[PDB]
Paper text:
[name] is a member of CD28-B7 immunoglobulin superfamily of immune regulatory molecules which acts as a negative regulator of T cell activation, especially CD28-dependent T cell responses. [name] functions to inhibit T cell activity via the binding to common ligands with CD28, the B7-1 (CD80) or B7-2 (CD86), with significantly higher binding affinity than that with CD28. [name] is an immunoglobulin molecule constituted by two β-sheet faces, the front A’GFCC’ β-sheet face and the back ABED β-sheet face. The anti-[name] ipilimumab has been used for the treatment of melanoma in clinics and also been extensively studied in dealing with multiple tumors in either monotherapy or combination with other checkpoint blockade therapeutics.
We expressed the single chain Fv fragment (scFv) of ipilimumab and the extracellular domain of [name] as inclusion bodies in E. coli. In this complex structure, [name] presented as a homodimer as previously reported and the binding by ipilimumab didn’t affect the dimer formation. Overall, ipilimumab utilized both of its heavy chain (VH) and light chain (VL) to bind to [name] with a buried surface of 1708.9 Å2. Specifically, HCDR2 and HCDR3 of VH domain and LCDR3 of VL provided predominant contacts to [name] with partial contributions from LCDR1. The binding of ipilimumab on [name] mainly located on the front β-sheet face constituted by C, G and F strands with multiple hydrogen bonds to E68 on C strand, K130, E132 and M134 on F strand, and Y139, L141 and I143 on G strand of [name]. Within this interface, VH and VL contributed equally with similar numbers of hydrogen bonds to [name], i.e. five hydrogen bonds for VH vs four hydrogen bonds for VL, respectively. The results revealed that the binding of ipilimumab and B7-1 to [name] has stereo clash to each other. The overlapped binding surface on [name] by B7-1 and ipilimumab was also predominantly located on both F strand (K130, E132, M134 and Y135) and G strand (P137, Y139 and L141) of [name], the very region occupied by VH and VL of ipilimumab. These results indicated that the blockade mechanism of ipilimumab was that the VH and VL of ipilimumab binds to the same region on [name] by B7-1 or B7-2 and thereafter prevents the binding to [name]. The variations in the loops may be explained by the flexibility of these loops while none of these loops were participated in the interaction with MAbs or B7-1. These analyses revealed that ipilimumab and tremelimumab bind to the same region on [name] with distinct binding mode, mainly contributed by the VH of these two MAbs.
Numbering used by the authors: 1 to 117
Amino acid sequence: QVQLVESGGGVVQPGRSLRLSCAASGFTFSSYTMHWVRQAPGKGLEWVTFISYDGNNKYYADSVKGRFTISRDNSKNTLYLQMNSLRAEDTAIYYCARTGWLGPFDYWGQGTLVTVS
């Protein structure tokens, strides 16, 4: 019954900003850490961001910092990926994935397509 739906994706142009949202349901939200993982067209999976339970700790991979900032609304059960300084390398399918309590990314979303002109 666990559902992770993402939105906000679309066709943007270099130098603009975007905001991606991930509505979550079917499970208590404040008991899991969250991830943003992206996949460039025809390429492999790449980890982007990670936010903790309380949202106090945010870890970003390289190629993204200052540009990307991750947020978490526990009151409305939604995840956020604020994407500034968008580049042609950023064009990818963005999934939000929740961490299994034992570590791995147990449940994923169907992702949103972001393309950069």
